[PDB]
Amino acid sequence: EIVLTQSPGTQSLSPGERATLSCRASQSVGNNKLAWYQQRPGQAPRLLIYGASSRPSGVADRFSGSGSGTDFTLTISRLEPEDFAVYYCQQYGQSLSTFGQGTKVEVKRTVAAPSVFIFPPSDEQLKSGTASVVCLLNNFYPREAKVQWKVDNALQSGNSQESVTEQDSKDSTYSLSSTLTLSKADYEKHKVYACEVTHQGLSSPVTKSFNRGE
Amino acid sequence: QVQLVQSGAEVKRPGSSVTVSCKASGGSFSTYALSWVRQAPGRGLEWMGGVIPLLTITNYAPRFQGRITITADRSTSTAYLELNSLRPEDTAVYYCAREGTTGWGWLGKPIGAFAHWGQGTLVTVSSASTKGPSVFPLAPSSKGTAALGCLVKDYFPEPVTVSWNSGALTSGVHTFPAVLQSSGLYSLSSVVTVPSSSLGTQTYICNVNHKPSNTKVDKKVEPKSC
Secondary structure (H helix, E strand, O other): OOOEEEEOOEEEEOOOOOEEEEEEEOOOOHHHOEEEEEEOOOOOOEEEEEOOOEOOOOOOOOEEEEEEOOEEEEEEOOOOHHHOOEEEEEEOOOOOOEEOOOEEEEEOOOOEOOEEEEEOOOHHHHOOOEEEEEEEEEEEEOOOEEEEEEEOOOEOOOOEEEEEOOOOOOOOOEEEEEEEEEEHHHHOOOOEEEEEEEEOOOOOOEEEEEEOOO | OOEEEEOOOEEEOOOOOEEEEEEEEOOOOOOOOEEEEEEOOOOOEEEEEEEEOOOOEEEEOOOOOOOOEEEEEOOOOEEEEEEOOOOHHHOEEEEEEEEEEOOOOOOOOEEEEEEEEOOOEEEEEOOOOOEOOEEEEEOOOOOOEEEEEEEEEEEEOOOOEEEEHHHOEOOOEEEOOOEEOOOOOEEEEEEEEEEHHHOOOOOOEEEEEEHHHOEEEEEEOOOOOO
16 A cells, blocks of 8 residues: 655745645655645545646646656745645545545744633533533644643643634634543542643743632 | 535444545546545644546555445536444544546646535544533622633534624633533533623623534523622
């Protein structure tokens, strides 16, 4: 089976610069059957390049495919705002077809520190028997951020889930939301509930906390 | 023309079978290879198989072989995809893709690469039952700019939509991607950053809508008093 490995995984550029994407196969692609695709979040894939180099009518001229044999290269001359998405490469020269893992092209912007907010569980939820503690990280860049749950200065492990928004189309930032989930009993068995955030825009790890009931 | 339209989202239990249709509008349904490609949530693209109705010819990917059936209906210009013995790891969005061509007829030749796609069909495999969400407030801290929101917890299945103040509040609004808890139920969070000076006077209502359960909940987020 032909394995396609794209490089790099994530790419951060400014609206106007050149983007170079790499695609390498485990063996050789017969008949140069190499295709490139584009995909904005929530949308179906879109063909940009077929036959390793050919461009379908309707596709902008700033897109160009090169390479032969094993390593190929998709190239975008001038990065328009709409060109920031995920790109996949594909071989279609064998009975079974395979895709690359994909390279994300995100917007490079000025470093921005996250605005940290913490939320205690509501009494309405506590009456149900569950306690959800939410830590909010607002409008930051880059996407790399670290969240730590400290209950009475004790670190936690597998009782918190986090999710991240897609890169905001206007300010090019990310937002994170972590949810610590305990029981009603365990929640009332402690006092201090804190969330420690480590990020590039923060010189020292910012911590937000509250005491139960207070 | 050449517009591929797929069937609506599916929610099946493990061990059951699902069928996703893909009706080709306009153009010529019989001549070209209509393939199927799935995209697991947060994952990449994976080719399952294809079909050319004119030659009665089907190719399957080894990982799906014996557990998949791609058919072609030239009478209605609709290709089908049956997925049997479903598992939670089958949960994904399934795309139908037709190979492009340079010209029409004896003229040119198909390109093999997928040039036309359907919107996709979300196939959700779970043993969980349909359940309306429980909306809990994220009270704006008593301690510039403040932040509040509503926690949409324990619902099934996707999706849940959230508007603020009947849509009058759009900027500063963030609705995070839901997470699948170990219980098997979903849970998202929606927030909005508002000026602190209006906290006491301005009323904030998050409008949570969950179509699969046909449930509508409006929850007013007011500051906690103590």
